[PDB]
């Protein structure tokens, strides 16, 4: 997260770190066993950390799972990243309580203006790289489609949405990737892509949640 | 334009 804040320990609960050896991108947990999070993270060997605060020390709180499965979803396409969301099973139930909880699906699409929470351990830098130990936080309105459209001509599918700063200096970078963008409280969006990190005119890119609550819910109560 | 995935690493297009 670039020109954000520190979140505090426990304070976005529902975030998970996917580490293989390191950490390599962001979820959210949907319920006790599952986890939502980006198609292009997608690799085996993947374990599902839960509680963290500082990823890089154990101080309490923390729960490590294997995932079962990653079910990619069937339409993704890595060149356009259309359809960039995947879904994780942890091998055995998350223990929910405080520090650790579950964050809702969306009922509806959210509007143009709403504004989000987005979170991760991503770079910090938007010219370089610093990674941070602790989890970052920032607070970002979703944009309007046509500024989102006029930013990426021809890139934008209806399964995606831009939410950010136009005048640079906030956003969602390299390592957030699969991370939650909660708005009052429902999970609307994936951290997806963009071009670099907080450029001016070049708002981060999120997967539309929202397009995909039947498919999640299908897939879930199949596996 | 060249458009990059936020993983770690990334993966790039154009
Ligand atoms: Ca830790």
């Known amino acids: ?223 | 334009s060249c458009r990059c995935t936020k993983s770690i690493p990334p993966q790039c297009h154009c």
């Open chain 1, 1 to 223: 997260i670039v020109g954000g804040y520190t979140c505090g320990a426990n304070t976005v609960p529902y975030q998970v770190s996917l580490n293989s050896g390191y950490h390599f991108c962001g979820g959210s947990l949907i319920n006790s066993q599952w986890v939502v999070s980006a198609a292009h993270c997608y690799k085996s060997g993947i374990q599902v950390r839960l509680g963290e605060d500082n990823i890089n020390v154990v101080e309490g709180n923390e729960q490590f799972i294997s995932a079962s499965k990653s079910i990619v979803h069937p339409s993704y396409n890595s060149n356009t990243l259309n359809n960039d969301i995947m879904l994780i099973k942890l091998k055995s139930a998350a223990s929910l309580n405080s520090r650790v909880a579950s964050i809702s699906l969306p009922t509806s699409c959210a509007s143009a203006g709403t504004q989000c929470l987005i979170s991760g351990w991503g770079n910090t830098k938007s010219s370089g790289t610093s990674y941070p130990d602790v989890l970052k936080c920032l607070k970002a309105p979703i944009l309007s489609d046509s500024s989102c459209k006029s930013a990426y001509p021809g890139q934008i599918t209806s399964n995606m949405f831009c939410a950010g700063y136009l005048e640079g200096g906030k956003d969602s970078c390299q390592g957030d990737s699969g991370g939650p963008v909660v708005c009052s409280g429902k999970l609307q969006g994936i951290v997806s892509w963009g071009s670099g990190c907080a450029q001016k005119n070049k708002p981060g890119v999120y997967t539309k949640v929202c397009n995909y609550v039947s498919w999640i819910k299908q897939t879930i109560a199949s596996n």
